[PDB]
User: What shape does this take?
Amino acid sequence: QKDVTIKSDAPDTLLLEKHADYIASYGSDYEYCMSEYLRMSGVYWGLTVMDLMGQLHRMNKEEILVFIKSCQHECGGVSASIGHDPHLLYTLSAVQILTLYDSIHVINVDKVVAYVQSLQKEDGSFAGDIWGEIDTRFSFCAVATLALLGKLDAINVEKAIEFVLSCMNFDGGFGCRPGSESHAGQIYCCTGFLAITSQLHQVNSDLLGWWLCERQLPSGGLNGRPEKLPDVCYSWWVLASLKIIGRLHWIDREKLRSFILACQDEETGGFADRPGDMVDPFHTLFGIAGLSLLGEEQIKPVSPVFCMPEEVLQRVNVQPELVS
Amino acid sequence: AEAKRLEREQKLKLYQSATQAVFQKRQAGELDESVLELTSQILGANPDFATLWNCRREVLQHLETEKSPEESAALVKAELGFLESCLRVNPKSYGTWHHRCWLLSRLPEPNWARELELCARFLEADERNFHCWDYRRFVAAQAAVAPAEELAFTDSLITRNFSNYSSWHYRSCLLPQLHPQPLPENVLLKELELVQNAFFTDPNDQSAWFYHRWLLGAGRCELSVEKSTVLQSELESCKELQELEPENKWCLLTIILLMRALDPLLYEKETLQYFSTLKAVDPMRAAYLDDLRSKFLLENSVLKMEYA
Ligand SMILES: O=C(N[C@H](Cc1ccc(O)cc1)C(=O)N[C@@H](Cc1ccccc1)C(=O)N[C@@H](Cc1ccc(O)cc1)C(=O)O)OCc1ccccc1
Ligand SMILES: [Zn+2]
Assistant: This one.
């Protein structure tokens, strides 16, 4: 019922060069400084999408590596920016970036590992930081961080799996915490987690795949849960989730591709949220990643688990078996 | 447009200047009231700025050991008010909601009934606010509320409005708790009656169709005569509803799943008919439906090889 209406003069072509220039020039504004609190992940999104486009060289490696080492704290966790507090989210993003650059010993890897280990609870869950918020988002951040580092064995993996599975719901999806409602962003985190821990046989793929594919609205866009508007973010999460579980074909690939292309800004470059809305590096990554997963030959193959070039993951020997 | 530009440029100067002063104050180790006013300014407009919620917590922790019981009690009531004003403006920030649990989790006697009432307020504003429902589940647990009132609470909310996916999900977790088995038929039947009601009232209501599919799986023929008659009755009601909504895909799918639930082999011809009508109405789900149909035609082949 709730859906966006794509206009007849929205883009139907892929504007790679416009997006690269948008990302290459992003950072030289208002909501840029308002978003200092997620700078580290913001850097991940730009770097990653540039590399998916073969344009990684146009970014400032040396500068970014220094920024990273200055964001690691004495507990070993990493903050979003300098002077901000450590969190699992920005620890993931920093390790994803360090792995894009083959430069993980820029930080203290043993300290990161201990930090991630310190945040696991009795019931297998992870807190995001010392202030104790529990969320399956952080279960993914911990095992994703640890596997890019080759240190999955450092945490109680069985208890972690058990917790994530206790967050599985009547519709085959997952939420934040036990009892929490199913949501596409949480489904992505949990299916990504289960991929990494080798537990995809515990997902009801036909039931969860059905829930996922009912996300696609007549516009071709996907929403994150019932009754919501479609957008490019939810479009990445759902698709990536479907691919992990072997069910990417349960979606109308053509209609989704066209939705995503309608989200491009043909003047400024970048991707937006929904068609003709204002662009950003978050939706630029997930638009490009989404189009790569659908089979765009101009874009490098993207991992639906880590949302990083497959070729990056191949180098470091971390490639989860997916369903099918 | 220039006044809108210039004011936001200043809201900067003010967001930027305040942020700067908070961090200055932090290295210094000035864990005081100064910091709470500055963060009060920044967190109101950007409550996703997580570090600052941490500062607030740090200040409040320090002042539980420089101020009196009374002074510290006043601080938390002031914190509660601040939080509620932060939620009115952004009811969906993770940090705001977690700061509220943090605060309440460390109080002596917290007023949990007040907090349950707050959730009921926020849920009439947005019945789909998952952060509010998660908070409600936290308050219910912290206050040993029983699954029956929460289940009574859910009865209300469905009939009252049509934003029920969140309410039906809560029901799906509450009912297992009323009958803790490592669903009873009498219960299943009662729930089957709530749900059809809901989807004949409003057939475009996708949440009930999803809850209903779960109910169908939830525990052949060991079909009692009651369940068998209830399912048969459900099947004809959907045919009735199909004549009224030829475009409605949810009742078409349900018809297929009802026949499966009744007798795969006996209803095989009509299942095949139903898949074609359905693929014609919901073409985006063409591939899912073919795969479902293949799965059932395999099951139908296994069932036929069990013969004599
Ligand atoms: O918080 C998020 N996701 C982002 C933002 C983000 C991503 C990575 C970071 O390091 C920091 C912030 C997000 O949009 N969250 C979602 C919900 C969600 C829940 C579970 C899993 C995924 C999403 C959210 O609340 N979005 C809000 C607002 C929002 C929109 C954009 C954004 O960047 C941050 C917040 C909305 O949709 O209105 O989950 C972390 C994560 C997701 C995917 C992969 C790794 C880590
Ligand atoms: Zn989005």
